[PDB]
């Protein structure tokens, strides 16, 4: 149901849809993409390392991310 591996088309859909997500979190990737929460956590970490989303809270159990600029 929810993807636990990421294919290349899912990876480019992440990098072309998570920018211009106004608010980004684990459940936001889980429901607006069709990935699971483990890839959602991994993708959040990877995308803030790249720097096109930027953090606000970075709590465990709840990460609030917004878009960069």
Interaction partner, residue 41 (RNA, other proteins, none; CB < 5-8 Å by kind): RNA
3 near RNA, rule: CB under 7 A: no
Pairing of strands 23-24, 65-67: antiparallel
- The distance of closest approach from Cβ of residue 1 to RNA in the complex, given in angstroms and rounded to an integer, is 6
For residues 25 and 40, give the distance between their C-alpha atoms in angstroms, rounded to a whole number.
8
For residues 68 and 18, give the distance between their C-alpha atoms in angstroms, rounded to a whole number.
11
56 near other proteins, rule: CB under 8 A: yes
Task: Please say which residue, 6 or 15, places its beta carbon nearer to other proteins.
Answer: 6
12 near other proteins, rule: CB under 8 A: no
Residue 44's CB is within 10 A of a number of other CB atoms, namely: 21
51 near other proteins, rule: CB under 8 A: no
């Amino acid at each position: 149901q929810h993807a636990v591996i990421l294919d290349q088309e899912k990876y480019d859909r992440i990098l072309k849809e998570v920018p211009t997500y106004r608010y980004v979190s684990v459940s936001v990737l889980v429901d607006r993409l069709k990935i699971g929460g483990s890839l959602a956590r991994i993708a959040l970490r990877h995308l803030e390392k790249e720097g096109i989303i930027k953090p606000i809270s970075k709590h465990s159990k709840q990460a609030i991310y917004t878009r960069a600029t």
